[PDB]
Amino acid sequence: GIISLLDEDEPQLKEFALHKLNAVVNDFWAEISESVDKIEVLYEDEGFRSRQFAALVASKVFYHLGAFEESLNYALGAGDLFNVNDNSEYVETIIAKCIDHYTKQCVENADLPEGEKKPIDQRLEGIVNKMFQRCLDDHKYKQAIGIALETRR
Amino acid sequence: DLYSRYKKLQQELEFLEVQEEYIKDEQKNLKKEFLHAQEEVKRIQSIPLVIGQFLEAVDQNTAIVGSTTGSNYYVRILSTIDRELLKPNASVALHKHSNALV
Amino acid sequence: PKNPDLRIAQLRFLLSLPEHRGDAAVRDELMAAVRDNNMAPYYEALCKSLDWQIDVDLLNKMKKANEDELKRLDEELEDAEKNLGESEIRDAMMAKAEYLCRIGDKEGALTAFRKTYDKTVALGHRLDIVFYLLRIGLFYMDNDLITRNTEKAKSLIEEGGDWDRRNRLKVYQGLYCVAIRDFKQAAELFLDTVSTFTSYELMDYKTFVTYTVYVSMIALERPDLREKVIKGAEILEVLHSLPAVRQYLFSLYECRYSVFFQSLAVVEQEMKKDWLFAPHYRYYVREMRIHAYSQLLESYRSLTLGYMAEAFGVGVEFIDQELSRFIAAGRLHCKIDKVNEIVETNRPDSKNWQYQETIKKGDLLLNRVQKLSRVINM
Amino acid sequence: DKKFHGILDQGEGVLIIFDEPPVDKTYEAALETIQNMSKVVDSLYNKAKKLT
Amino acid sequence: YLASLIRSVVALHNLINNKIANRDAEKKEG
Amino acid sequence: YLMEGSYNKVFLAKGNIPAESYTFFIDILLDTIRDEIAGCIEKAYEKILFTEATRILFFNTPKKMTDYAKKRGWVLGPNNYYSFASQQQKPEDTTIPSTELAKQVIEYARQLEMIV
Amino acid sequence: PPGGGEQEPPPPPAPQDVEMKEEAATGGGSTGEADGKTAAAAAEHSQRELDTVTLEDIKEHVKQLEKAVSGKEPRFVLRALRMLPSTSRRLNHYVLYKAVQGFFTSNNATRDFLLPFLEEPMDTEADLQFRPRTGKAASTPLLPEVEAYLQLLVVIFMMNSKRYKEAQKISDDLMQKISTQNRRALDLVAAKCYYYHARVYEFLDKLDVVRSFLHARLRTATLRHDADGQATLLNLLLRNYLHYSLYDQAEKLVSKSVFPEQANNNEWARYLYYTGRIKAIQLEYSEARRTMTNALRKAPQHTAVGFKQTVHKLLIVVELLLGEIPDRLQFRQPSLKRSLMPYFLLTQAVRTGNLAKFNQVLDQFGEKFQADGTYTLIIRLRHNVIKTGVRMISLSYSRISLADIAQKLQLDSPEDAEFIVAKAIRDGVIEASINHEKGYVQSKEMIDIYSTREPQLAFHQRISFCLDIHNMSVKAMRFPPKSYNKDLESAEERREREQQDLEFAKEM
Amino acid sequence: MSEKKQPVDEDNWDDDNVEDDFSNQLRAELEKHGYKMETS
Amino acid sequence: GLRQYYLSKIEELQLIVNDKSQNLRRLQAQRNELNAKVRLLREELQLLQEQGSYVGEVVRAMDKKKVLVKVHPEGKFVVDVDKNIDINDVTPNCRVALRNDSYTLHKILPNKVDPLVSLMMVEKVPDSTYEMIGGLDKQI
């Protein structure tokens, strides 16, 4: 029902929308699943008060559709509000995207990192050594001996 | 350890992948090899052929003939014969030495 | 006994199905029903009948006489086995277990019949037992059990010729093929009408003649009708006593179309009030009408609609709605014009009509093996 | 009586005469096979449906 | 259409011939 | 009523708008009749004078009949709606069946001989 | 005392006799054989669990005097069921409470005493890690609470027992669902508690927040394990979304989890029906009717068939929407005849060309069609009625006035008799021209469809079809091949004696 | 076996085709002819 | 996140192991049956070079695993038996199979037709019953 209010041009209604696009994101997940995808419109519209949160709710909504590269590029472009939460059933959904894509990227970066290297985001490598500090600090080292191999570093 | 539990378990996915391709190869190779030996059996059937008469069969693919030499015999078959072309007083062909159905 | 046994079921029809007609059937059917020791098959026919609470003692004297024949079977089964003539218990109830077939129900019949089937090493009694199972399978219309003993029957006649057991059997397959709506097979089993006999079940030979002509007039075309039924003296001398049936046959052959609907309404009316044809009396004349319409209409091409009311049968709007529902029924190959008052015919090929039933049977058997294909393998 | 076939016109008496057997041998011979096989599938209940 | 119609019935009859070879072998051998 | 060939009854519903004005919607309902029988004026209509198909829709004699009669055919004539009907060119092709069907015969032979 | 003392003491022991063998062998088997080594893909306590549902749906009927189920609860709830040293006394605890039923009076579970039959996961070394034991031993008391349903204050006992079942259920949702069939086993228990969990909420409660927890259950479905949460969570999702459907259907169009690719012959079967009515109500007709048929032909050989009464009706609802009509009473039953009386008369009206006959049925059973929940689909059939009329008459007559067909079709109007037939040319039902000036409707005689591409098309639909059913009867013929171990060529010792006698014959 | 997990709750066919064409038409078509003798 | 990440792969790979293993077990037996057909088909050309087996007629047995067998055109022979044939199973007046090099008793064949059965088959009396008797019931 909040799909209708997308021609306002007062962007405060759009931030009122993304106020409703995060907390109850599962029942209208059915409703707006493929219909409207104007996240990039206000995410790129210089009426910013919605960009650093906008790619979060897209990274929520496309997940059960699949779209791991859609919610992965929006996971990188989602900024600080994305990775600030790890007390959910969603950090396992996103590190299985980003760490896997990072290490299968680093297979190519074990092949040819010199020349045509890829624009690795600082969060794309930042939650790698951050979650690796979760490995070192959460007392497990038969895995912390392992992800250090997995990053090919 | 847990780190070997995934790498050594995809190791048998690489080891697992080849084998269906292998039986895929042998699937046709036993056919094309099978048709070679399929015709190969009729070297016994060629010229120097003696004649008996079919009498009855004990079982599947082993029977009893009556030779035109007068004496009866317990003989073997040849497999490619339609068995439904027999059972009356069938005039049959016998190998002159091995003495089996031809 | 099973020789007068079909009139009983015909009168159960005459009791039950005509609603107004239910008085003489409970007269004569009781007249035969509480005599000759009949006990079992009319309790539900007594429910469909009236109260008849006075007949309790009538049931008691006859379950008493039923007990008398039962207990003298029980008197025979020990001297019968004392000296062995040929399994003389089953030599007693190979004649009295058919009494028990009439008197009791099918069960003490059937175990004594499948029992006694193993006694007579020659089929001269076996095939009579099988005839009895055919007739009770007809009475209880055991349409699966008739399929068994018809094949088990026919398997016995090939040794010997037994044409009094083969043509007599063809009477049974004729009555079953006319029991179902299989008429081209029913007249085909009704082919002879010569070796057929002054029966126990069609005690009028001429009723059998009416049956075979009523099934023949649909079942065969003109060439056949113009040789077989028109030149048979044995078929001619028996409709020689028939005033209407000889007329009803010759009104169709002699192009007497207007009276053909009158006698058609007569025979259709009696057929409506007839056992074994009352399942398909509407099926009969809906084929008769389109048959005569095919006969006259497949002669000319430019014959008009108003011609047929006076020479064929009255009612212009009746012929209108009647041919309209038959062209609309996808048969009766013509194409009627309306507002210039003319009926035009064509001729189709034997292609698309013959194509039609092939796609019907193809879709039917596809449904069959698809359904069974889901039945097996979970 | 179908010994001869054609048509008869009523306005002026015209007999269009025509004859060809189009196809008779094919579809019926392929057709009665189907009603044999239906009986075969009916027999497949009595070795398949009751059995397993 | 006739030949393709009959061919599936042939393979169906063979599948019946295989499930009789399954169900009366699993209990018999064990 | 717009589903079936009910047309004059739709104009009777244009004679009965009971709830409120509904004008903005019955004018799109005007237009959706205009293109409708502006389209299905093109049928097997053997000849019609300037009365019947004239007054079924809306317009007796403005130059709106020139707008339709010159937008499409059905040319302004001597009290005449010209029934042009060719319907002849596009049939009689074996070649497109000899391409699609020649594809489909190979599609038979794939799942006929080759094990999958 | 004589009637109670002679008729009441045999209701305990023979249900005790079967319940020492059904869920005590499902208890002794499913615990040591799902939490044990493994229950494989060919599981046995899944279908044994189906039997220990279906016998229990028809097992309890009475309020359980003499404690025949009422004493089974305080018996079977005091269970450690830890290991053979702890279950070795539990095998005596299947019998020690029979001394309490037969000798004494047990705790009569009659609508009040279920709460002291619940906190036993605390009592006496009972755990939750054996959720093959505690989900089965959760459900096995959770079932007969709601089997009779007997709505009198039991809804809260049901409810809190479903809350403990939700503690076991969330413990499956988060805690070690791998390689035990914890999630795979408790998807069965999940759906089977969603049936009663459903019908209580349909009875007296709300519906819409268990939708959201169901979205969470679908969210955790397909990710960790990829079976049976993919399946049942979409029919059980659908069941009132259809009854409250609108646009959600397109979600089921774009759903990845439409296929679970295997759904145990019944959830797939009703699944194709639940999505069949989707295309039925959202107007996709011809695609709907084939999964109506496919949903019909996958149902078992049982007699209680009310859903088959529903699909038997709706399956030819849409075919009446498409003009084609088979016969429906070809398998008519005493449970199908009374529910086909009105409906066969409806399609009897449709197969005629009459107009107001449709009204003569719609007044007669319009409330019945509202009771069928289909009246808004019944209401649109008159289009098909007039297509039947114009096809019947246009096929039948050849040169008929338009001032006759409106009167015969009781249309009350010849002025749109041009117009319905005009949309019969727009729809292309009839081809030839109407003499609009004169008044008659001529029709050409278009014959010889035999020389068309189209009978080859009706073939080509079926050629590849019957080839495919041949090929599936080939792919499904690969389950008998086994135990082909030793292919002995001839022998060894007879070959050696053949070498000896052959050496003697060459020696001669 | 034959369980049906429950979420929700010749002699005839040629006769039935006779009902299909002649469902309700001319049931007692016996006297209409004699009623058309004077009108036709 | 090593729990929720690294353990999330063992749960997935095993599913491919389970059904591709099953497809492999199907396909290798698939090859197996055909391989048995190949070896069995090849073996016969060596086996069909083997000499014939004589047929005989057991008169009666005697001591120490021995019998007395006559041949058609020939004379009577005393031979032994093979290890797989029982003496009580050896019946007098029965045909047997016989090897030719050492005349070891090979196998017991089907029985001889009874001479009484051949006798009545020669004579061909008209088999009858009570159902073809005309009026002789006192003599019956």
Describe what this molecule looks like in 3D.
- The PDB classes it as structural protein.
- Keywords: proteasome, zfand5, Activation, structural protein.
- The entry is titled "Proteasome-ZFAND5 Complex Z+A state".
- The structure is cut from a larger assembly and holds nine protein chains of nine kinds.
- Chain D is mainly α and 52 residues long.
- Chain D has one helix at residues 25-48.
- Chain D is rod-shaped, with a radius of gyration of 23 Å.
- The N and C termini of chain E lie far apart (44 Å).
- Chain H has two helices and no strands.
- Chain H is rod-shaped.
- Chain I has two helices and five strands; from the N terminus they run H-E-E-E-E-E-H.
- A five-stranded antiparallel beta sheet of chain I has the order 3-2-1-4-5, with no helix packed on it.
- Chain B binds chain I through residues 2, 5-6, 9-10, 12-13, 16, 19-20, 23-24, 26-27, 30-31, 33-34, 37-38, 40-41, 43-44, 56, 58, 64, 70-76, 78-79, 95, 97-100, and chain I through 6-7, 9-10, 13-14, 16-17, 20-21, 23-24, 27-28, 30-31, 34-35, 37-38, 41-42, 44-45, 47-55, 71-74, 97-98, 106-107, 109-110.
- Strand 3 (72-76) of chain B pairs antiparallel with strand 1 (53-58) of chain I.
Record field, number of beta strands of chain I: 5
Tell me which protein chains meet in the greatest interface and how many residues each side has.
B-I, 41 and 43 residues
Distance between the ends of chain I: 105 Å
Name the beta content range of chain D: under 5%
Distance between the termini of chain D: 57 Å
Report the structural category of chain D. mainly alpha
The amount of helix of chain D comes to 40-55%
Q: How are the strands ordered across the major sheet of chain I?
A: 3-2-1-4-5
Q: What Rg of chain D is obtained from the alpha carbons, in whole angstroms?
A: 23 Å
- How can the largest sheet of chain D be summarized? none
Shape annotation of chain I: elongated
- Rg of chain I computed from alpha carbons, rounded to a whole number of angstroms: 32 Å
Q: Count up the helices of chain I.
A: 2
